[PDB]
Amino acid sequence: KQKSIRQKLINNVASQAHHNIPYLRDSPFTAAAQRSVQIRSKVIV
Amino acid sequence: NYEQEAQKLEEKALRFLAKQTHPVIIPSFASWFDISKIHEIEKRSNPDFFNDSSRFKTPKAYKDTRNFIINTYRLSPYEYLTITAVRRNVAMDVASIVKIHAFLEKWGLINYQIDPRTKPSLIGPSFTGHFQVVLDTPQGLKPFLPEFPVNLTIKKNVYDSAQDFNALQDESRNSRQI
Amino acid sequence: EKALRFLAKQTHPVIIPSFASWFDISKIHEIEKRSNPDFFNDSSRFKTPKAYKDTRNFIINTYRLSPYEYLTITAVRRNVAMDVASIVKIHAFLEKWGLINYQIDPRTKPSLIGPSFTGHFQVVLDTPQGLKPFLP
Amino acid sequence: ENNGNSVKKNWSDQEMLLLLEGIEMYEDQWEKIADHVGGHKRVEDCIEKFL
Amino acid sequence: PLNWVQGPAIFHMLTSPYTQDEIINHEMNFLKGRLLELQEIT
Amino acid sequence: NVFQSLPKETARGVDDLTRMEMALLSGIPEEIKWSLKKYLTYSNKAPYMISLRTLPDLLPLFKTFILPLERIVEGLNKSSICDSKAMDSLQMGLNALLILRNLAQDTDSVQILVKDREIKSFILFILKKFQCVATGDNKWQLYEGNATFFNELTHYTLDLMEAISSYIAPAMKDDHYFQTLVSILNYTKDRYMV
Amino acid sequence: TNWLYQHSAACSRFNSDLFYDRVKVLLVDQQGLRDAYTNILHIPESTQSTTVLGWRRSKNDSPSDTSIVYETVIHDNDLNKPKTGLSEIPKEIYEDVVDEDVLRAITEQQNFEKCNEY
Amino acid sequence: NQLIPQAYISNFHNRLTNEDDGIPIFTMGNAVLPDLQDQHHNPFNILRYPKIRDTFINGKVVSPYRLSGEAIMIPITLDIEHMGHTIKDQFLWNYNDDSISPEEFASIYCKDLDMTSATLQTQIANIIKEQLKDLENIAATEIMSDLHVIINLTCNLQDRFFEDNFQWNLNDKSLTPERFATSIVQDLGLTREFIPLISQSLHETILKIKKDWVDGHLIQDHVPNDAAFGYLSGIRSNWCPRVEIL
Amino acid sequence: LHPRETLTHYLWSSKQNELVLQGDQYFNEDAARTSDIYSNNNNDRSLMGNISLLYSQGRL
C-alpha cells in the first residue's frame, strides 16, 4: 500500500518536472520545447 | 541601571504593540509593496506628488496618507474601508485622496474581496529560520537618562507549519487538544 | 540692556552640542544669513533683522528656562508678534541645528494622533495555487 | 490511553498502531484515518508519516 | 459592461510530451469529449 | 447571519484574466513567467479571449517586452548572455513574440497590429539582421553559440510578415521588405520557410 | 523692567500646561481613543516605531526540522544621541563655517544619522 | 476552514446614525477596542467588546465601487436637508484638476451614506457646480505687496467651538495651512478630525481677504495690531488658541 | 578578442548544465524503494512538500 502511494507521489511530482524545479524551466532547450509545442497552426488565406 | 532601563523599555514597548488577531491577505502580484519606502510603481502611477508641480503635494504627505489608509485598514481587515471615512480624518483635496484610494484598491493592498476557506495552503520558501523583523525605537518611549545600542526581542512566537502560520495559531492547541 | 537680568536670574545652565560650537549668542552671521535670507534681502517692512534678533533670543532663552520640556510652536506664538510663517521657519531652524529641542524628556514631544503601526504584522500571499506565507 | 501526548512528531507506539489499524480499516479517506489516530493530527502529517 | 462568464475548457494534459505525434490522439479524444458535451446545450 | 449572503462569483479572489494582466504590469519576474505561460496557453487554445479588438490596453503590455529585444539582437554577435538575468529577459521577449504571432491569425486581432507603426520597425530590424546572416557580410557576423537563440527568433517574425503583408498591399519601388525577403529566398534550405 | 521674564515665564507655564493637558487625556485616563468613523483605536504616534528596518535570517539548531520562528525586535544606535536632523540640509551651506572640527562634528552627526539601517 | 473572509462588511451608516458617536454628518480591561490587547488567537474573544459585536450583528454586505501645473484649492460647504435627517459637511476641491467629476463624487458620497436615491446625486452635483463656478477667478490670484493681515478664526464641531487669533502673511507661499492645522492639533492633543476642519475653515478666510484685494481693491494695509514685541515697535503677542465647550 | 565575458559565460553555463544533469539522480530503482528520500531530506525540500497540494486535488 505504501508502494502504491509512493507511485502516485513520484508519478505526479516527477511528471511535471519543468514547472516547479527552477533550474530546469530556465534552461534554453526546455523553454524552447515548451514554447514550440504551443505554436498554433497557420491559417491558409 | 542599564539592565533595568532595558527591561523598562521592553515592558512599555510591549504595552504599545497592536497585537495581531486577524490574518491579512494580499494578492501575490502585489508583493512589491513595503510600508517603509516608496516603490517606483507608485512614482509613475501618481506622478502629481513627485513632479514638484504644486505646493500641496509633496512625497511626505503622500506617504503619510498612504500609511494612514493602510494602517486603518489592516487593524480592521474584515471591514470594507470607504472613502468618506478617510476624507474626514486626512486633510487633502478630494481628487487626490480618491486617486490614492483607488490606486491602493487596484493592487489589492486594501479592500481585497476573498474567502480563504475555499483555497488550499502551500510551503513556498524554506521551513526554518529565526525570521525577526527589525523595527525602530519609538521616540517617546526612549529612556530619560539625564547626562547604549541595546536591541530587544519583544515577542517570540513559534509555528509548527505553514498551515498554522496562515491562521495565526501559536501552538495554543495544547490548550484545546480537541 | 533688558535681557542681561533675564539671563542672570532664572536660567538653567547651558547644554550645547559640539556641532553647535559655531553659535554666537551676541550677533548673527553667514549661516543664518544664507539659510533663511528673507529677513535680510528686503522681503517686507516687517521682516527687519532686529526683530529676528529679538525672536531668536526669546526662543533660545525660553528653552533655557525649561531645558527638559519640548518648546512648542504655539507656546512661543503666545508672546511673539510675528508671522506664523516665520515663527515656523525660525523654530525649525533652531531645532534643526540641535539647540533648543536637543536634550529633553522624549515623552514631551507632540505627536499627531493616528492609528497604530502595522509593519510587524503577518501577511499571507494569494498565490494562484495556494496561500503560501510572505517570508522574504 | 486517552490523554493528550507530548509535543508533536514523537509518534508513540499507540499512535503508530492506531494509524495502521486505520489503514487496514478504510484503505483511503485520510480524515477517517486522522480521527481514528485521535484527531490531534492532521491529514498532511499522517500521510507524511506513513510514507 | 461586465459579464461573469465561465471560461473555455482548456486541455491541460497530465503528462506533457513535446513531440506532436504523442499528442494528437489525446487531443482528438478531447475534441470529441468536449464537442459532444457542448452540443446538447444548443 | 451576514456571512451567509456572499456572492459566489468573487469569493475566490480576483479572476484569472485580471490576475494575468496585473502580473505583467508589476515587476516580479517569476509572476511575469507565470503570466506569459498562461497568456501563451490561452492564445493557443482560445485566441478570441485575448483578441486585441476586445482588450485594447494589452498590446503596449507586450510591446514593453518585445521592444527591448532589439538590444539583445544587436549584442548577439558576441557571447553577450552571461548571467541568468539577461537570459530571462530573452526568454520573456521570445515568448511574447510567440504570443503576438499566435494572435495574428484572426483578421480582427491583425489590423491593430498593422496600424501600430512600431512592430513593423521590429520586423524590419529582425529581417535586416537575417539578411546580414544570409548574404554573408562581414558586418554583424553571427556568433554560432547564440544560433539556437536566433533561429527560432526568425521563424516567429516571418510568420508575422506572412500575415501583415496583405496590409502592405501597395508595394513601392525601393522597398526594404521585398528586397530583404528576395535576398533571404536564395539562401535558406527550409521547405516551410521557402 | 519685569516685562520679558514675565512673558517668558508665562510661555513656559503655558507650554507645561499644554503638556499636562495632552498627556492625561490620551495616554493616562483611557490609554488611547476611539475613532467614530472607523473602529480603530487612535494612539499618539510617538509610541509606534514609524519605520521598519531590514530582515534577518537564521537557522534552527536541530536539523531536519519543520518549525517556523517568526518574531520581532527593536534596534537603535547608542540610544542617547538625538535625531536633530542635519541630513535635511544641502552640503553647500556649512562650508564657510568657522572651524574644521565643527565640520568634523557635523559630518559625524550626519554619518550617524545615515546609519538608520544596520 | 475557520477563517473570516477578508471583506463584505461595511457597517458605516449605522455608526452615522448611532446617536452615541459624535459624527456631524447625519442627525436622524477598560478599553473599548482591542488594538493594544492580545486575545490569545481566538477571534471569538473580540466578541466581548461592545462596539464589535455591533459591527457583526448590525453589519451588511457591500459590493466594491469601481473606477495641470498649479493646484487651486477651493473650500466647498454642503448643507442639505433630506427626509428629516440632514447633511452638513465641508471639503476642499482642486479647481485645476478635473480627473473626477462632481457627478462621480456625488455618486460615491451617496453610496457610503446608503441612500442611492438617484436625486441626491443631482442636487449635490449642482451645489458643487454652483460653488465652483461662482469662484473661478477669485482664487487664481497672484498676490504681492505684503498684506500681513490679522485673522480671527472659529470652527464649529458639536458644541466644542475652536477659536484663535494670529497674524498672517499672505504673500509668501512657504507655510501650508494644512501643515499649520497639523501643528495646532499636534500641540493641543485634539482628535484627528480637527485636521481638515481647521484648514477648510482657513482657505475660505484666505479667499475672503483675497476677495477685498481684488473686488473692491481696498488696500487698508494700516497697522495690524500687535503687542510691541515683533514687527511694529510700540514700546519694546495677540492671543492663543483654545477649545471652549458652550 | 574579449576574454572576460566569455569566461564568465563559461563559469555560468557549465554550472547550470551541471545542475541540469544532476537534476535526475533520485528516481532510481533502489533509491526510491529505500527510505532516503522522504525521511530527513528537508535539505532537498522538493518532494514531500507537494503532499499539501496533491491531496487537495484528490490524486492522493
UniProtKB/Swiss-Prot annotation, chain A:
Transmembrane segments: none annotated. It is found in: Nucleus. Belongs to the SNF2/RAD54 helicase family. Interacts directly with SFH1, CSE4, histones H3, H4 and H2B, and via its N-terminus, with RSC8. Interacts with LDB7, NPL6 and RTT102. Component of the two forms of the RSC complex composed of at least either RSC1 or RSC2, and ARP7, ARP9, LDB7, NPL6, RSC3, RSC30, RSC4, RSC58, RSC6, RSC8, RSC9, SFH1, STH1, HTL1 and probably RTT102. The complexes interact with histone and histone variant components of centromeric chromatin. Present with 1990 molecules/cell in log phase SD medium. Catalytic component of the chromatin structure-remodeling complex (RSC), which is involved in transcription regulation and nucleosome positioning. RSC is responsible for the transfer of a histone octamer from a nucleosome core particle to naked DNA. The reaction requires ATP and involves an activated RSC-nucleosome intermediate. Remodeling reaction also involves DNA translocation, DNA twist and conformational change. This is Nuclear protein STH1/NPS1. It comes from Saccharomyces cerevisiae (strain ATCC 204508 / S288c) (Baker's yeast). The lineage of its organism: Eukaryota, Fungi, Dikarya, Ascomycota, Saccharomycotina.
From Swiss-Prot, chain D:
It comes from the Eukaryota. Residues 6-51 form the SANT domain. It is found in: Nucleus. Present with 3380 molecules/cell in log phase SD medium. Component of the chromatin structure-remodeling complex (RSC), which is involved in transcription regulation and nucleosome positioning. RSC is responsible for the transfer of a histone octamer from a nucleosome core particle to naked DNA. The reaction requires ATP and involves an activated RSC-nucleosome intermediate. Remodeling reaction also involves DNA translocation, DNA twist and conformational change. Dimerizes via the C-terminal coiled coil. Interacts directly with HTL1, NPL6, RSC6 and the N-terminus of STH1. Component of the two forms of the RSC complex composed of at least either RSC1 or RSC2, and ARP7, ARP9, LDB7, NPL6, RSC3, RSC30, RSC4, RSC58, RSC6, RSC8, RSC9, SFH1, STH1, HTL1 and probably RTT102. The complexes interact with histone and histone variant components of centromeric chromatin. This is Chromatin structure-remodeling complex protein RSC8. The gene is RSC8. The chain holds residues 305 to 355 of 557 of the full protein.
UniProtKB/Swiss-Prot annotation, chain F:
One of its GO terms (biological process) is transcription elongation by RNA polymerase II. The gene is RSC9. It is found in: Nucleus. Keywords: Chromatin regulator, Nucleus, Phosphoprotein, Transcription, Transcription regulation. One of its GO terms (molecular function) is DNA binding. GO terms for cellular component: chromatin; RSC-type complex. Present with 2610 molecules/cell in log phase SD medium. Belongs to the RSC9 family. It comes from Saccharomyces cerevisiae (strain ATCC 204508 / S288c). It comes from the Eukaryota. Component of the chromatin structure-remodeling complex (RSC), which is involved in transcription regulation and nucleosome positioning. RSC is responsible for the transfer of a histone octamer from a nucleosome core particle to naked DNA. The reaction requires ATP and involves an activated RSC-nucleosome intermediate. Remodeling reaction also involves DNA translocation, DNA twist and conformational change. Component of the two forms of the RSC complex composed of at least either RSC1 or RSC2, and ARP7, ARP9, LDB7, NPL6, RSC3, RSC30, RSC4, RSC58, RSC6, RSC8, RSC9, SFH1, STH1, HTL1 and probably RTT102. The complexes interact with histone and histone variant components of centromeric chromatin. This is Chromatin structure-remodeling complex subunit RSC9.
UniProtKB/Swiss-Prot annotation, chain H:
GO terms for molecular function: nucleosome binding; transcription coregulator activity. It holds the Pfam family SNF5. Keywords: Cell cycle, Chromatin regulator, Nucleus, Phosphoprotein, Transcription, Transcription regulation. Its main location: nucleus. Phosphorylated in the G1 phase. Residues 71-112 are annotated as: Interaction with STH1. It comes from the Eukaryota. The keyword Cell cycle applies. It is found in: Nucleus. One of its GO terms (biological process) is double-strand break repair. Transmembrane segments: none annotated. GO terms for cellular component: chromatin; nuclear chromosome; nucleus; RSC-type complex. Component of the chromatin structure-remodeling complex (RSC), which is involved in transcription regulation and nucleosome positioning. RSC is responsible for the transfer of a histone octamer from a nucleosome core particle to naked DNA. The reaction requires ATP and involves an activated RSC-nucleosome intermediate. Remodeling reaction also involves DNA translocation, DNA twist and conformational change. PANTHER family: SNF5. Interacts directly with STH1. Component of the two forms of the RSC complex composed of at least either RSC1 or RSC2, and ARP7, ARP9, LDB7, NPL6, RSC3, RSC30, RSC4, RSC58, RSC6, RSC8, RSC9, SFH1, STH1, HTL1 and probably RTT102. The complexes interact with histone and histone variant components of centromeric chromatin. Belongs to the SNF5 family. Present with 3940 molecules/cell in log phase SD medium. This is Chromatin structure-remodeling complex subunit SFH1.
